[PDB]
């Protein structure tokens, strides 16, 4: 019961220097429709890269230090994350880069962004497997005034 859900530039990149620079409010607008009445699981980095808890959701925090806030649920290990999330049908896993090569292996289903951009980065999607992946929905944007890039929504399911 696993999906991760994630936005990628260029050559997989997905952030740089705790940023995506990436201003996409429709792909924000996907995620949080995607997300919202779920569990997400993140990484530390990206607890700090959000900087605040995502309302509506059980936000639940990778780190092997103490958690520093109580307003979100802190775990130590990507089986007590899942238990952590309670017996749900969808878990979410929101990044980062060392999160989702984790969670990878298990899940079942990608929600991926495909941005038209190019980002020089410093974190990078996982290289997986695309022959065990099957495209079940595409949907591409094209750039307009609130939104600087081209984009396509797919949403991918473990053959
Ligand atoms: N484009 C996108 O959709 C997207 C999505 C998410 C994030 N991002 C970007 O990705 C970057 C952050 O990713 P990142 O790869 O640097 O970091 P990350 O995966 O967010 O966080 C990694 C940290 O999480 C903790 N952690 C990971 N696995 C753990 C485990 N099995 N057990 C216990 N703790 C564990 C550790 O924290 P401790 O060091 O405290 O132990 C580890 O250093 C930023 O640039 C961010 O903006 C982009
Ligand atoms: N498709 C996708 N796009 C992303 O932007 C994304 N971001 C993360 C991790 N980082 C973030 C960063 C910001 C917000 C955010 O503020 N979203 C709002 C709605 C839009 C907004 O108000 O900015 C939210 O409540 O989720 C969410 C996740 C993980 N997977 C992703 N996946
Ligand atoms: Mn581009
Ligand atoms: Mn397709």
């Not at 079942?108 to 290289?127: R, S, W």
Request: proline share 6%; with cysteine; hydrophobic share 40%.
């Amino acid at each position: 019961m696993i999906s991760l859900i994630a936005a990628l530039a260029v050559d997989r990149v997905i952030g740089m220097e705790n940023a995506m620079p990436w201003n996409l409010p429709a792909d924000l607008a996907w995620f949080k429709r995607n997300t919202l009445n779920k569990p997400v699981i993140m990484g530390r980095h990206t607890w700090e890269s959000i900087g605040r808890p995502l309302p509506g959701r059980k936000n639940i925090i990778l780190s092997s230090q103490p958690g520093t806030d109580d307003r979100v649920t802190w775990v130590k290990s990507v089986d007590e994350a899942i238990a952590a999330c309670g017996d749900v049908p969808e878990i979410m896993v929101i990044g980062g880069g060392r999160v989702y090569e984790q969670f990878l292996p298990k899940a079942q289903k990608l929600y991926l962004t495909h941005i038209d951009a190019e980002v020089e980065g410093d974190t990078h999607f996982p290289d997986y497997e695309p022959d065990d992946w099957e495209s079940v929905f595409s949907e591409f944007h094209d750039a307009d005034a609130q939104n600087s890039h081209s984009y396509c929504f797919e949403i991918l399911e473990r053959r």
